[PDB]
Amino acid sequence: MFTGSIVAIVTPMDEKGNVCRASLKKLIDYHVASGTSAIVSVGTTGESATLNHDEHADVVMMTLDLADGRIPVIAGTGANATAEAISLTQRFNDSGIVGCLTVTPYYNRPSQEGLYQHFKAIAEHTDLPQILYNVPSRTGCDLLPETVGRLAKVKNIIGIKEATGNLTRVNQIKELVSDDFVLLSGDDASALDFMQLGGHGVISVTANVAARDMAQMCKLAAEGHFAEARVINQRLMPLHNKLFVEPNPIPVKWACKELGLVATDTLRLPMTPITDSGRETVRAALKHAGLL
Amino acid sequence: MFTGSIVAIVTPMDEKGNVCRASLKKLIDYHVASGTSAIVSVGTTGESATLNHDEHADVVMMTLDLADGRIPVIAGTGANATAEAISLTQRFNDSGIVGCLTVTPYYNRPSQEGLYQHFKAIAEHTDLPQILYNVPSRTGCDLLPETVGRLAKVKNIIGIKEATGNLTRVNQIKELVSDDFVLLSGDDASALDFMQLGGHGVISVTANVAARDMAQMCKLAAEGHFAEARVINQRLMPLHNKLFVEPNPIPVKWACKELGLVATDTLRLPMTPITDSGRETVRAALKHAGLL
Numbered sequence: 001m002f003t004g005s006i007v008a009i010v011t012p013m014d015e016k017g018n019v020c021r022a023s024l025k026k027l028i029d030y031h032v033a034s035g036t037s038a039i040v041s042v043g044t045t046g047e048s049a050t051l052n053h054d055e056h057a058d059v060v061m062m063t064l065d066l067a068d069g070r071i072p073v074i075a076g077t078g079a080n081a082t083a084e085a086i087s088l089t090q091r092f093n094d095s096g097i098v099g100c101l102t103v104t105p106y107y108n109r110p111s112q113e114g115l116y117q118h119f120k121a122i123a124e125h126t127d128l129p130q131i132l133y134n135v136p137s138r139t140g141c142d143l144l145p146e147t148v149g150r151l152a153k154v155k156n157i158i159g160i161k162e163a164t165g166n167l168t169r170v171n172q173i174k175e176l177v178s179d180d181f182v183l184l185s186g187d188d189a190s191a192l193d194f195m196q197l198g199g200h201g202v203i204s205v206t207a208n209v210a211a212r213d214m215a216q217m218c219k220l221a222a223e224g225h226f227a228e229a230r231v232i233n234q235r236l237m238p239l240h241n242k243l244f245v246e247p248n249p250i251p252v253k254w255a256c257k258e259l260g261l262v263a264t265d266t267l268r269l270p271m272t273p274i275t276d277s278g279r280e281t282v283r284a285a286l287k288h289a290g291l292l
Numbered sequence: 293m294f295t296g297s298i299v300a301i302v303t304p305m306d307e308k309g310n311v312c313r314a315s316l317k318k319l320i321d322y323h324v325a326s327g328t329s330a331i332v333s334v335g336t337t338g339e340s341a342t343l344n345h346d347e348h349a350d351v352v353m354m355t356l357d358l359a360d361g362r363i364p365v366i367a368g369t370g371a372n373a374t375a376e377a378i379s380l381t382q383r384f385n386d387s388g389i390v391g392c393l394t395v396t397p398y399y400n401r402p403s404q405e406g407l408y409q410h411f412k413a414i415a416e417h418t419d420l421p422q423i424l425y426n427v428p429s430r431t432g433c434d435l436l437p438e439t440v441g442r443l444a445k446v447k448n449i450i451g452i453k454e455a456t457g458n459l460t461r462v463n464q465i466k467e468l469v470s471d472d473f474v475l476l477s478g479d480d481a482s483a484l485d486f487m488q489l490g491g492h493g494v495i496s497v498t499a500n501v502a503a504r505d506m507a508q509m510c511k512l513a514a515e516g517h518f519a520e521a522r523v524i525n526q527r528l529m530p531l532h533n534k535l536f537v538e539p540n541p542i543p544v545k546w547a548c549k550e551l552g553l554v555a556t557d558t559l560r561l562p563m564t565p566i567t568d569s570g571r572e573t574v575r576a577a578l579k580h581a582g583l584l
């Protein structure tokens with residue numbers, strides 16, 4: 001649903017740069033097999049920026065079809081224009097999607113008031129649960145805990161993906177929102193720490209290629225078995241880091257291909273192919289995790 | 293024209309958020325009469341993010357039509373997807389614009405090699421001059437001088453809007469490009485310093501409301517009369533700063549309204565109306581500049 005290991009799934013593409021169904025089907029089966037709790041479709045790692053609105057909707061609907069009720073699917077619906085965010089969201093109303101992941105507007109650097117009005121308006125145009133998403137390093141914008149508190153009062157604003165890697169945010173937000181508001185890490189390297197502080201899970205890039213370990217680690221964390229969970233975290237830490245050796249999702253797409261999970265590691269410009277050095281780095285990280 | 297005071301023009305809107313032709317005409321006539329070198333149409337200050345592709349093109353074409361040959365128009369054509377950038381550019385080929393201002397992809401954080409391939413691909417499918425645009429605070433991405441140097445070898449890549457406010461970039465870039473390559477400030481508050489170091493002009497937010505003073509300041513700077521330019525700059529400095537007291541273009545649209553240059557200060561979400569405290573700040577800066 002909205003806890004545990006949630007995969008920020010890649011959009012696998014053929015050499016032409018269009019979604020590859022066979023690869024998408026292989027990935028989804030793998031997540032179902034591995035115990036992944038849910039899939040985020042066409043979020044950041046799914047190359048949301050470079051899919052047009054129709055292409056974006058198609059990938060989400062295809063993911064939902066292929067999941068075939070076996071695993072929940074959350075749609076990426078973020079946009080930096082409120083009217084676009086509303087349109088994208090309306091696309092998935094009454095679709096089978098369990099919720100939306102919606103990022104703070106990027107580039108235009110809205111005020112906290114603007115963030116409030118943006119997300120409130122979006123929530124008002126849907127019955128679907130909304131997970132806010134803060135990632136200042138990508139957006140130029142930082143959704144502060146006070147504003148998260150203000151927004152958590154909206155009935156269908158139910159959680160946040162917190163990707164700052166600033167762990168003080170966990171308890172700053174938790175103090176301002178109801179006990180059923182969900183706190184999800186958006187930073188693999190700090191996600192276990194985030195859970196140890198009271199977070200409920202992670203929207204993970206690492207989970208694309210270590211789905212079983214990620215699921216197990218989040219289960220252990222949820223049970224309060226943090227020392228056990230850390231053994232797994234330490235095995236995965238090189239992946240947590242080196243999957244960003246080059247811009248995400250360049251490394252994780254290559255890793256998927258290397259593991260036979262997808263047919264090609266093709267991306268859309270301005271993402272470009274992994275370097276030879278990046279290949280060796282990511283391979284060593286996979287070896288360390290015992291995946292290769 | 294790619295030197296001197298270039299205005300990063302507002303997209304004046306009515307109360308419903310639709311482009312106001314009468315207000316835009318007034319602004320263009322003001323810039324013609326006040327000595328502005330050129331108009332950037334639908335750039336960052338023009339709310340590029342919240343205009344759809346069709347609306348974007350409409351504003352550029354309206355701006356050309358109204359300019360009626362009296363002032364050069366540069367079109368904002370930036371996108372975080374290389375396909376979108378190319379498509380936008382194709383709409384404006386043979387339109388009458390003199391060039392394009394194209395920002396580094398935002399949100400997806402491409403590598404330097406990605407930036408290279410993005411801008412090379414855009415430049416390839418047009419004869420129009422391209423001005424690169426670097427603004428890490430908005431994009432999450434920093435186009436480094438090394439890569440600017442590489443790109444400058446492409447025939448129609450002819451300049452950069454450098455909005456870091458990091459003044460070391462001026463001569464780091466200058467050393468790597470030909471004498472013909474234009475270096476334009478994208479930070480009003482450091483723009484005169486930027487020109488004193490070798491820069492050729494400024495793509496200015498302040499120029500929306502202080503067009504004549506900006507024009508004179510930049511001419512004095514081009515002539516090496518830095519102490520003289522600095523007197524003007526010091527009267528404008530409150531505005532250079534306070535036009536960002538709330539997210540651009542909120543303050544500057546309000547200021548335009550206050551001077552009678554536009555009918556309404558309306559924006560599109562996620563921009564929201566100026567606060568009262570913001571009104572007071574901006575008003576005081578306008579008075580300091582001798583404009584009210």
Ligand SMILES: NCCCC[C@H](N)C(=O)O
Pocket residue numbers: 048049050051052053056079080372373376399
């Ligand atoms: N995936 C939907 C369309 C994205 C449009 C644009 N590239 C943006 O990032 O906002």
Ligand SMILES: NCCCC[C@H](N)C(=O)O
Pocket residue numbers: 080081084107340341342343344345348371372
């Ligand atoms: N102005 C063209 C359409 C823009 C699409 C999207 N809002 C972006 O900022 O990239």
Ligand SMILES: NCCCC[C@H](N)C(=O)O
Pocket residue numbers: 017268269374375376378379
């Ligand atoms: N108008 C579309 C142009 C094609 C660009 C596309 N991004 C590519 O990789 O080829």
Ligand SMILES: [Cl-]
Pocket residue numbers: 008040043044045101203
């Ligand atoms: Cl995501």
Ligand SMILES: [Cl-]
Pocket residue numbers: 300332335336337393495
């Ligand atoms: Cl601009």
Ligand SMILES: [K+]
Pocket residue numbers: 151152153154155156157158
């Ligand atoms: K709520």
Ligand SMILES: [K+]
Pocket residue numbers: 443444445446447448449450
């Ligand atoms: K050139």
